[PDB]
Amino acid sequence: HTDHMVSIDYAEGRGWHNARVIPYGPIELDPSAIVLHYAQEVFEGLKAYRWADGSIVSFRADANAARLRSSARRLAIPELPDAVFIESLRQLIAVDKAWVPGAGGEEALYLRPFIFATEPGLGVRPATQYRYLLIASPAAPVSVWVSTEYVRACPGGTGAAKFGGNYAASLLAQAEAAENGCDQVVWLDAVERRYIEEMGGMNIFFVLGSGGSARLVTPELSGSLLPGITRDSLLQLAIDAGFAVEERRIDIDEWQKKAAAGEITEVFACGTAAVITPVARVRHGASEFRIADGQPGEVTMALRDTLTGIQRGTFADTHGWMARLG
Amino acid sequence: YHTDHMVSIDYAEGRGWHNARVIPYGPIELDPSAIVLHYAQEVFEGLKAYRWADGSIVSFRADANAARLRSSARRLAIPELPDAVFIESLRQLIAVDKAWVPGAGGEEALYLRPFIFATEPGLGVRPATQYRYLLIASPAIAPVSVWVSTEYVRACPGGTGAAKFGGNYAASLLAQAEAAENGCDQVVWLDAVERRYIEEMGGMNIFFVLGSGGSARLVTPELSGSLLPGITRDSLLQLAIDAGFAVEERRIDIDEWQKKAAAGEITEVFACGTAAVITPVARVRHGASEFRIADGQPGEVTMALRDTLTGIQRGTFADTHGWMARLG
């Protein structure tokens, strides 16, 4: 973690107030603070990048701001205004700027904005007191384990929110994966236990065919998986590069069948931390199957090169995704 | 409000659960990266301590809570707190804060809140290697109306609904607001997959009474894997059998509830749980539909069971099943 953190308080009637930059250090809670009992909390994640001209920039921070608000609404948490969200990013970079790594490769500074209920009380109801903190931390094909025993979120629930509870529910599967020598978990839909949703901390894309004829398929926003900002961006970039894209349902049977037939030629996972991570093989119960030759796919690495290029300030930001933080 | 003291126990991978100690009730500290603040790795319980006429403090089925906290812990990848350490923590707090247990023998008792949360600093999504357990205490039949949630779902099969886990409660807060907006006091939740089978209330299990007198049948949702196996629920099923009522655990459709209530087949409805013991349900809102349960008054079977269970917990009715045990 870096040297400082940004703290902001909420009190009913007063709104979000008392924003201040303080050292990174322990915080205090009443034993009956609602977050310790009923998990009323939401969070975000995004990076600060250093550019060649010496500036520090963010990638689609406005999207994170709005998503923290969408998550907060689902959890009955008062929304942090986008302007205050953005300003907290600027405040932290101003004091901890030396922590942002050099330009220009994979290295960046990870920013963790988060909100938790602090009001003391064992009644099960939305809190009237909260805290927001902003902290910072300095920041290869994988195998995936299909979870059949566990479900992470369901329609009408909290899966489209970045809510701590979704991650808690995933811990046992994430241990069961490692016990099968897999790197990550792919989650299936709650209702029919068939349709691909997402991985534990990433969205998932499928490449079908190859060359100019190659096209992208990704699970549609079901209501129970996260609308990732990397996912959103890659949809836009694929369209920019002339790839057909389909947001639709795809189940594990279609995945296995089309991979075996060689129609699915690449699979990749995407998210803020790794940008894009190739998926080489899949374990589904007793069976295992490989994606193509198990190596990083052509479209996979082309999209990754485009997106990291924009983020590092090497390639034109045609969508106006980058903004200055310091 | 809270009593004077709390019990604190730490978990670390070399020591396991250790350093159990009675300390004043007061603020606790967490690293900003403590896993509970990001990924909600936490579970909890709730039970009461009762003062009896003879001066003793007793627990009701505290062994059941000890085991359920372990079951909850297991589902949330939390190292289990041994049952003996759980029971001892109840005894430790009652020993110093006994004077806080209210007088015998009405509705008043001392509510106990055992709870575990992840304290290890780290932003990696993995089970914590460090936890804290706290035990805190807090001093503790009007019919209610219920709103059937059709828009929100509280837990998923394959999920965490059979565990007493903070995240189930977090997920439920938005629906509880829609209920108030429609005049109702509590929320009834339906199953995730088919959006039609009755699960439970936000903090209580639900029962239906069919018919009347000795031939009445007590009906309750079967354990689905996504609703909480309430200890009050478990006890009332036994008490119903003791009394000679037929009991049925099964899947019950929401469209069956209103239909049988309107036909006079469902004669009573109630909710049960640690805090209120039994709360009669008078009225139900489901979408546009609204229906009443009989005359809206507490039902005969409802109050017979409530009187028996409260009687056992206050020591005035014979404890045939050995549910009551000395705390201090």
Ligand SMILES: Cc1ncc(COP(=O)(O)O)c(CNc2co[nH]c2=O)c1O
């Ligand atoms: C469940 C889940 N799905 C998808 C994603 C990808 O979302 P994106 O990053 O906005 O593209 C994340 C990562 N979300 C996080 C982003 O930064 N830290 C995170 O935990 C996630 O936790």
Ligand SMILES: Cc1ncc(COP(=O)(O)O)c(CNc2co[nH]c2=O)c1O
């Ligand atoms: C979702 C849910 N279902 C059912 C119940 C009833 O469970 P029982 O009390 O064991 O009969 C509770 C209350 N659980 C609590 C028991 O004490 N404090 C509580 O929050 C609950 O929170």
